[PDB]
Curated annotation (Swiss-Prot):
Signal peptide boundaries: none
Subcellular location: Nucleus
GO molecular function, one term: DNA-binding transcription factor binding
Annotated binding of chloride 1, by residue: 63, 67
This protein's name: Runt-related transcription factor 1
Complete-protein stretch covered: 50 to 173 of 451
GO cellular component: basement membrane; core-binding factor complex; nucleoplasm; nucleus; protein-containing complex
Record function comment: Forms the heterodimeric complex core-binding factor (CBF) with CBFB. RUNX members modulate the transcription of their target genes through recognizing the core consensus binding sequence 5'-TGTGGT-3', or very rarely, 5'-TGCGGT-3', within their regulatory regions via their runt domain, while CBFB is a non-DNA-binding regulatory subunit that allosterically enhances the sequence-specific DNA-binding capacity of RUNX. Isoform 4 shows higher binding activities for target genes and binds TCR-beta-E2 and RAG-1 target site with threefold higher affinity than other isoforms. It is less effective in the context of neutrophil terminal differentiation.
Record comment regarding domains: A proline/serine/threonine rich region at the C-terminus is necessary for transcriptional activation of target genes.
Keyword terms: Acetylation, Activator, DNA-binding, Methylation, Nucleus, Phosphoprotein, Repressor, Transcription, Transcription regulation
Binding residue positions for chloride 2: 90, 121
Lineage: Eukaryota, Metazoa, Chordata, Craniata, Vertebrata
Length: 124
């Protein structure tokens, strides 16, 4: 259930737009191609089988799909941990990217990260 998931990951997870998925926290603003401080995780709340692929894509109006690195992970015990997810493509100072999560169940489910993310050459 959701109480167990929160008891296994206390004060680490946050909501997505989808009631079936939670995720780890990402920085609001980060350096282009820099290693993340918290490794990305997608936690499923339903019965998602082991080996189910999760893919993340970043984008806005002027860039439908910004370049990423290691944007795919496999589900194991309801968690899909991204080994070294990095944001290469840059939103610039004027815009932020919306981060969309796709969990490849039959049929696939699409979820959105709760905040937009700003990606610049220097970062904060
Ligand atoms: Cl790009
Ligand atoms: Cl920039």
């Amino acid at each position: 259930s959701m109480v167990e998931v929160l008891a296994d990951h206390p004060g680490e997870l946050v909501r997505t737009d989808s009631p079936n998925f939670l995720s780890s926290v990402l920085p609001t603003h980060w350096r282009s191609n820099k290693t993340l401080p918290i490794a990305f995780k997608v936690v499923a709340l339903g019965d998602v089988p082991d080996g189910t692929l999760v893919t993340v894509m970043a984008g806005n109006d002027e860039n439908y799909s910004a370049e990423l690195r290691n944007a795919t992970a496999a589900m194991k015990n309801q968690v899909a941990r991204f080994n070294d997810l990095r944001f290469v493509g840059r939103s610039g100072r004027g815009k932020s990217f919306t981060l969309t999560i796709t969990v490849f169940t039959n049929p696939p489910q699409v979820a959105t990260y709760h905040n937009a993310i700003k990606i610049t050459v220097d970062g904060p």
